[PDB]
Ligand binder design. Structure first.
Ligand code: ZD1
Ligand code: ZD1
Lengths: 649, 649
């Protein structure tokens, strides 16, 4: 029994942990399957991808091509249908017709063995025809056989009759494959489209209150949902909605002691009022939450709840399950940390005294919110809990409810980021906020749209309550516009945290990435009506970007992405394609200065010849342009961050 | 059950074909086992490699270290012992003693949590003692426990008592590892030293004849063996020793028609006088071959025979086993080809009619020569026979005779070259002859000494009967000296083909890599005694290089190799280390002009600090130098091709 088969097919990709975990896709997503394929000797090889659905049903004929000369690396694009666990193989084979044609094209004009060459061709086309059904196609090939055998015609005429486009056409659909050799199957987990594609909006319900009751309730926060839906968002991410501890409650601006009216951090979960399966009393009741969920759903919005596996000192778990915490010799539980940050208001969970009880309680809590319509969870700091714990929990939840989506908020080292995605997190936060130059963006997106896409789906939040980047602090509104265009067009999933659209960019202090007067620690009423009337919000641009994504399939996927060269370091250009849809984006990364540049398009990567001209429409403005291999652009910050163009027919 | 364990241990390397083929080593060879290891949170992890022999016996405690900050990539060096099939795993674990010592070193000097931190250490060392079998080792740790708890003693002294050498010694032999998590075993094939290390010499017995009988015999050719052994070679590689066909026999200089006394190519195997298991009548008998092998062995020389699975048209297989060839419709067999080259004198074997018969006959032929003392086979053009055919044949032969070494003469594309090594070829020919500039040599040797070394062992033939490189053609003797130094010091296995040491360098024509009057097609009598009297041979340099290799373990391994920067493109510098042996080589790649350069040594890669001395002896001259971090060299072609230095201790 040999490891290599008759025709080598080696190192099939995508592959995750050597085949022990599934590669990822969503319904309708196209991705490349590749392999190393070659044979002994100099005859031609062919290959094809066999994609099988959860019932074992194979997909269409999907022939492969060598991706670059002399590499023996072959690839083809496949497309996932329904959700479930699929599998794929690569089949490799001797290609006798290509081999014979190449030898006949030489030997016939040279007059070498022409009788043998033509008869071998005749026998070979007969062999091909034996497998073709449909009298017409088989007749086509058999007529080429008879022409090859017709010694009353010149040798070149007999040969030419085997090389007509009509014959190529039959052979294209019904190729003759020798020595077919298959790779072993690899697993593919196909999930619902929202796992890859969607626009996210994060806000704090308690901040959306009234003049007379500043602390919002679920009923007053529900009134914010129409504006969010109107900006074209699909997912609403809420910080924790549970009671908040009082012991070591944090005050405003991340101070260590709260005054009497201070609301504390929502992540300091738990009190005598309840824990992770309960509602903060000032938000109202579970029925109020159901109202919020209902109103969201009527607007096409899905709720994502924060799941933060940790506790305030007042949480019932502290006395109900002491073994879920690490106690020092004096009984104290050290407060959680994520250095250099400190979380004085919470205890971290310890997992090694009662891992079964913790997994049971975790999936209980998730299934409670799932029963109330929550099918997406944003998991807070997953990298401070064991990787295998999430592996278990996610497998459990998705085993009964495969539609549930888990988003990993893991801003940490690459190994942990990648492993969390690989053990089942449907989506991952990314380094996006720290990729701001053209070089950083090009390199990072080349990584994310490449091999990493077989196990990770990025969620590009342009800001979070914890990340106000210096780019936004120093660039003002034109920088907010640039980052929104970049996030919305470079990832099929993007998000903003409320106040982004108002261009809030005052840091806690120079060199910080915290917001001054952060909403994590205080109510943050925002005058949405005034900002809208005065035009001091970028909500219209956000709306337009989400509309462009909804109208352009190229922007609803990740892996098809190509950067085109420009001659200015501050101007980046890239395109994305899905079927006949092509989107071409040119962004001025400079938020302070007008930039002119020549964008030299790689015409073939747009499916075009070098001399063609591409008619494009700038979906941000509706202006039409005529663009060829080389195009002058002039982008004035404030007036326009970018061109977001579709190529027209 | 989860794929990831409690402490993640991921992507263990080396790995070949995802673990379905073994990684390679030889007895006494060191190599690095690496893994991605981390945990949740910020406490310290530890890791170790468990290498198990063919009986499953674990090797010594082999702790790993993180290889670069923030990468979570860990490594440790292991050393292979006796031949056979070994395995290795990586274990990872929480390291509570390291974690506590780091905390205590910060807290105790600041007087923070002193009683609590000291008590944490006390009960931890008590935990470590629980598993210590020896009464005196337990009493050692309990001594530190008692000092840690001694409240009548200064806090600094309580801590210091936990950090003594006596304590460390107990914990090095019984470390406290928490949450120990293991990878699944990976296979390692350990083979005899000659698989990795050896000097090879190829010659044609038929050329070593007499004026009365120009065609040498095994009895006359045996007279070359003293000179070959005196040059310090270990392996004699013979072209095929079988009868040679007459039908379509090639003439001199690869012409298509032999005339009269023409001897033909030895690779055109087979006649009515016998096939692959027979001796050419002009070479003598099987008994004469036995005499040759015996006389070789008495001189410390092993015989490698050429195995060329192909037939002259006169080979008995052509009519006994017609199904071992591809036939055209008139029943004729096309001659073999390897574009752009043509082999009009032979038929290629076909493998798809009777693969079992071909495997059976192949291993029968190999076992015949094995019974006559041939334990090494040079396999001609393996890439024109199926990869899985060699996989099966090599596993069959090595299953009964694991000492047999197979060398793949596959000058082809990278995937096939890599795959042949991976399915079992002990050694591979390489791109060496076509790597002649400093950039070329540095990049290629970086590849060969890096990940390729887990599956392939290079044999650097500086020439072969088919490869006379333009570098040698244009450079003359200084070029032969350079390529010998390079081949001998960059690979633990190197070789030359007879006449290399005479600096034979006349090509068939401008732009060809064939030799004029190639020995493949004619007897080539050489007056060896006269060349040595006239000093036109570099046999003294070849002899010296082989002695240097035999005296310096650093040159008998592959993976430890470092290139040091110089400030002239034509001057390359590199070092190799094995234990306390260090070899430092500086080569002038320019065969025409003297070159002056400053060599700037990466002292840490030598095991030295930047201020230290590098006393070296140039083993080519016996000269001594006092080198340092920056050394001026001057190398004159024809006089000093290189410095080949050992570092003195
Ligand atoms: N990476 C996330 C992790 C945490 C920790 O749960 C959250 O931190 C917030 O919540 C803590 C507990 O109440 C406060 O101590 C911090 O001051 C405040 O920033 C945020 O989601 C985000 O930083
Ligand atoms: N890569 C090796 C392959 C072959 C083929 O076996 C050998 O080629 C020699 O043998 C042929 C058959 O006799 C002749 O046709 C060629 O002219 C002569 O070069 C050499 O070992 C080497 O080229």
């Amino acid at each position: 029994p040999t490891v290599v088969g008759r025709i080598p097919v080696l190192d099939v990709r995508p592959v995750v942990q050597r085949g022990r975990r599934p590669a990822k896709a969503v319904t309708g997503e196209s991705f490349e399957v590749s392999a190393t394929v070659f044979r002994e000797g100099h005859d031609a090889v062919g290959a094809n991808v066999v994609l099988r659905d959860p019932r074992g049903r194979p997909g269409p004929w999907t022939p492969m091509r060598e991706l670059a000369p002399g590499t023996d690396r072959w690839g083809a694009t496949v497309t996932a249908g329904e959700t479930g666990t699929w599998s794929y193989t690569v089949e490799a084979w001797g290609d006798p017709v290509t081999t014979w044609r190449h030898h006949a094209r030489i030997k016939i004009p040279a007059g070498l063995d022409t009788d043998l060459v033509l008869e071998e061709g005749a026998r070979l086309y007969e062999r091909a025809a034996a497998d073709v059904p449909g009298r017409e196609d088989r007749r086509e090939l058999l007529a080429a056989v008879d022409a090859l055998r017709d010694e009353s015609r010149p040798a070149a005429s007999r040969l030419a009759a085997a090389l007509t486009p009509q014959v190529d056409a039959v052979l294209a659909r019904h190729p003759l494959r020798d020595l077919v050799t298959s790779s072993d199957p690899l697993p593919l987990l196909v999930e619902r489209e929202r796992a890859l594609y969607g626009a996210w909006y994060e806000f704090f319900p308690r901040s959306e209150g009234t003049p007379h009751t500043p602390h919002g309730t679920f009923r007053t926060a529900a009134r914010r949902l129409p504006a969010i839906a109107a900006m074209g968002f699909d997912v609403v991410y809420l910080p924790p909605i549970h009671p908040i501890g009082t012991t070591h409650r944090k005050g405003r601006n991340n101070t260590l002691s709260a005054t009497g009216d201070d609301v504390g951090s929502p992540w300091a979960i738990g009190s005598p009022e309840g824990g992770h399966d309960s509602i903060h009393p000032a938000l109202g009741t579970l029925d109020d939450f159901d109202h919020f969920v209902t109103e969201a759903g009527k607007l096409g919005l899905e709720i994502a709840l924060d799941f933060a596996l940790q506790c305030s000192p007042d949480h019932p778990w502290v006395h109900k399950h002491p073994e879920w915490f690490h106690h020092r010799p004096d009984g104290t539980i050290a407060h959680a940390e994520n250095p250099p940050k400190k979380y004085q208001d919470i205890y971290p969970i310890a997992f090694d005294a009662d891992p079964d009880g913790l997994a049971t309680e975790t999936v209980r809590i998730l299934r409670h919110w799932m029963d109330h319509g929550v099918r997406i969870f944003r998991v807070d700091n997953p990298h401070t809990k064991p990787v295998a714990f999430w592996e278990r929990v996610i497998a459990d939840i998705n085993g009964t409810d495969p539609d549930v989506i888990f988003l990993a908020e893991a801003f940490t080292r690459p190994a942990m980021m990648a492993t969390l995605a690989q053990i089942g997190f449907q989506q991952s936060y990314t380094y996006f906020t720290w990729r701001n130059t053209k070089q950083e963006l090009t390199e990072y997106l080349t990584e994310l749209s490449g091999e990493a896409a077989s196990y990770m789906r990025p969620n590009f939040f342009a800001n979070t309550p914890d990340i106000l980047h210096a780019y936004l602090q120093h660039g003002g509104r034109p920088a907010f516009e640039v980052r929104a265009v970049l996030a919305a067009t470079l990832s099929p999933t993007w998000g903003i945290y409320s106040g982004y659209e108002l261009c809030e960019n005052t840091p806690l202090r120079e060199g910080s990435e915290e917001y001054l007067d952060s909403e994590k620690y205080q109510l943050k009423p925002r005058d949405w009506t005034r900002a809208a009337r005065e035009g001091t919000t970028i909500a219209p641009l956000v709306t337009r970007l989400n509309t462009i994504r909804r109208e352009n399939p190229a922007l609803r996927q990740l892996r098809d992405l190509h950067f085109h060269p420009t001659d200015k370091e501050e101007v980046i250009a890239y395109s994305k394609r899905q079927g006949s849809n092509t989107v071409l984006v040119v962004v001025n990364l400079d938020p302070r200065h007008t930039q002119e540049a020549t964008v030299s398009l790689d015409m073939p990567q747009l499916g075009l010849d070098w001399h063609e001209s591409v008619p494009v429409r700038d979906e941000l403005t509706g202006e039409t342009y005529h663009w060829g291999r080389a195009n002058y652009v002039r982008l004035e910050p404030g007036r326009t961050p970018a061109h977001v163009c579709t190529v027209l027919r």
